[PDB]
């Protein structure tokens, strides 16, 4: 159809985030590309205001699930692409176990031929010497299942999952995600059956990037419907 045809090949991506965590303000810009035929995302971000005040891994989920690979038998369950090119609003609250929380609102939509994710993030109530503001998180990422259900009343979807952030002392800090996606346009979207996205990420550094930065690779495939 229309929305899914926008994703048949490689699509450039722009990411812009303004954040405020415990009054510490910052901005991030990122760019790369997505290829939903492979379910693959590649991005590089820089903090344009200096040092990022939180660990980079805690922003991974905030920094475009329209690039998931949906198998052909599940095509009618791909809300994200069906809302394009007009886009969708992605809102989250992220609860870090025994620590603060992020509240994010993003617009994901096409601006020309580029898919753009513009985000506002506010974090509150973090312990200034917790795992987060104390940068005790390892610079890595694990695999998670992203659970999706329709929210017919709001003409969108509800999404939730729990991220495992490995800590430098060998423990794990859980980040509990609650997400709702709502279409920006008034065109019709696909309201899916219950399913999930199998996601995997890897983080690295660009040895020639002098600014505080993250390189992110994500693989995302939809499953859970025979």
């Amino acid at each position, epitope marked *: 159809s229309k929305g899914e045809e926008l994703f048949t090949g490689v699509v*450039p991506i*722009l990411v812009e985030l303004d954040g405020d965590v415990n009054g510490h303000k910052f901005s991030v*810009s*990122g*760019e790369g590309e997505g290829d939903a035929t492979y379910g693959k995302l590649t991005l*590089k971000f*820089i903090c*344009t205001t200096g040092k990022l005040p939180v660990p980079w891994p805690t922003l991974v989920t905030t920094f475009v699930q329209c690039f998931a690979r949906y198998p052909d038998h599940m095509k009618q369950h791909d809300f994200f692409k069906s809302a394009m090119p007009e886009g969708y609003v992605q809102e989250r609250t992220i609860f870090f176990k025994d620590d603060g929380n992020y509240k994010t609102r993003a617009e994901v939509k096409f601006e020309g031929d580029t898919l753009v994710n513009r985000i506002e993030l506010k974090g509150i109530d973090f312990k200034e010497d917790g795992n987060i503001l104390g940068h005790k998180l390892e610079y890595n990422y694990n695999s998670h299942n992203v659970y999706i259900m329709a929210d017919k009343q709001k003409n969108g979807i509800k999404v939730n999952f729990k991220i495992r952030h490995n800590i430098e002392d060998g423990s794990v800090h859980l980040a509990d995600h609650y997400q709702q996606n709502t279409p920006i346009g008034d065109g019709p979207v696909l309201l899916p059956d219950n399913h999930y996205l199998s996601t995997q990420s890897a983080l690295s550094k*660009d040895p*020639n*990037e*002098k*600014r505080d930065h993250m390189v992110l690779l994500e693989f995302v495939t939809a499953a859970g419907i025979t």
Partner: nanobody
Amino acid sequence: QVQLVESGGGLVQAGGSLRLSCAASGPTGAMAWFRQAPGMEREFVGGISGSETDTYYADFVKGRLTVDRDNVKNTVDLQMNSLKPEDTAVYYCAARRRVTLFTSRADYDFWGQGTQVTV
């Protein structure tokens, strides 16, 4: 394709000042200056995002330099103060199609041919 035309530079001695300028054939995104000392690796000096809202200078360029940009003329300019003999190098204008001011040379799409600066 997009071509970058460098001018300025040349010979100075310590303490002096020098100016470099770069003119782009067309409009572009982030613009930056790099330099490459004789057998060293190309390092980022300073630049301006395509939107001009982000300016970044390397650590060694302290407050000694100023980059400005002109999206109508499609030019980025660099001015150098308090020159030291370690500033001797071949300076390169660089630009990207896209807007973000990354600093790795691999992120840049268009290059000038290199302008000698000798302090």
